[PDB]
Amino acid sequence: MTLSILVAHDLQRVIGFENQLPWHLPNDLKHVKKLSTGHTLVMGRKTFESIGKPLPNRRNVVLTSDTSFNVEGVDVIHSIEDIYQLPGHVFIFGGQTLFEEMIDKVDDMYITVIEGKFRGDTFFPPYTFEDWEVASSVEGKLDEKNTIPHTFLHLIRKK
Numbered sequence: 456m457t458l459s460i461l462v463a464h465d466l467q468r469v470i471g472f473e474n475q476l477p478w479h480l481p482n483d484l485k486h487v488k489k490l491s492t493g494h495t496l497v498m499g500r501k502t503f504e505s506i507g508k509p510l511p512n513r514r515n516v517v518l519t520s521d522t523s524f525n526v527e528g529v530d531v532i533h534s535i536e537d538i539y540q541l542p543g544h545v546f547i548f549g550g551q552t553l554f555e556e557m558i559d560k561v562d563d564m565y566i567t568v569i570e571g572k573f574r575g576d577t578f579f580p581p582y583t584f585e586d587w588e589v590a591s592s593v594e595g596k597l598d599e600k601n602t603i604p605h606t607f608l609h610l611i612r613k614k
C-alpha cells in the first residue's frame with residue numbers, strides 16, 4: 456500500500472473554510488506527523504499556501520500549473536500522472552481537488568473523522584463502506600487541548 460489518502464473531515468465531509476482548517480485539533484496534527492514523517496506528501500497549490508512552509512522531515516510535493524513555482528525545500532509536479540512516479544509511500548494531502556482526483560486510485564485512506572458540523576467551503580468526496588474495509592478505528596483522546604471528539608479510521612479498498 457504505497458498510495459494513500461490522508462484527510463480530516465467533519466460529519467458532513469467539510470475539510471476547509473476560507474483556506475484554513477475550521478477546527479483546531481493538535482492530536483490530529485500529531486497523527487499526520489506520525490504517519491507521514493520520512494515519507495512523501497502530495498498537495499495542491501492552495502493547500503501548500505495555507506501551510507506556508509514545507510513540513511520538516513518528509514518530502515513535500517506541490518501540484519500546480521504555475522511554471523514559476525520553485526520553492527526551497529519543495530518539489531513541484533504539474534500533472535496528476537507525475538504522482539505515480541514518486542518513490543516510497545505517498546500520501547495525498549489535499550485539498551478538495553486532489554482528493555476528488557485520487558479517491559478512486561488510492562490503496563487506502565487514513566481519515567480523521569471530526570465529530571462535529573462546521574461551516575465549510577471545501578469538501579471530501581462522498582464514499583461508501585461498501586467499497587472500504589475498516590482496518591482500524593481508534594477514538595481520539597479528549598483533553599484541554601483537544602476538545603472536539605474525533606476518530607482515526609484506516610480504510611482499505613475492498614477487492
Ligand SMILES: NC(=O)c1ccc[n+]([C@@H]2O[C@H](COP(=O)([O-])OP(=O)(O)OC[C@H]3O[C@@H](n4cnc5c(N)ncnc54)[C@H](OP(=O)(O)O)[C@@H]3O)[C@@H](O)[C@H]2O)c1
Nearest residue numbers: 462463470471474475499500501502519520549550551552
Ligand atoms: N481537512 C483536510 O484534510 C484538508 C487537507 C487539505 C486541504 N484542506 C483545506 O482545503 C482547502 C484547499 O483545497 P482546494 O481544493 O481549495 O485547493 P487545493 O486542492 O489545495 O489546491 C488547488 C490547486 O491545486 C492545483 N492543482 C490541482 N489539481 C491539479 C492538476 N490536475 N494539475 C495541476 N495543478 C493542479 C491548482 O493550482 P494552480 O491554480 O496553482 O494551478 C489548483 O488551483 C483549504 O480550505 C484547506 O485548508 C483541508
Ligand SMILES: CCc1nc(N)nc(N)c1OCCCOc1ccccc1CCC(=O)O
Nearest residue numbers: 461462463475476483484487505548549567
Ligand atoms: C492537520 C489537518 C489534516 N489532518 C489530516 N488528518 N489530514 C490532512 N490532509 C490534513 O490537512 C493537511 C493539509 C492542510 O493543512 C492545513 C491547512 C490550513 C492550515 C494549516 C494546515 C496544517 C498545518 C497546521 O495545522 O498547523
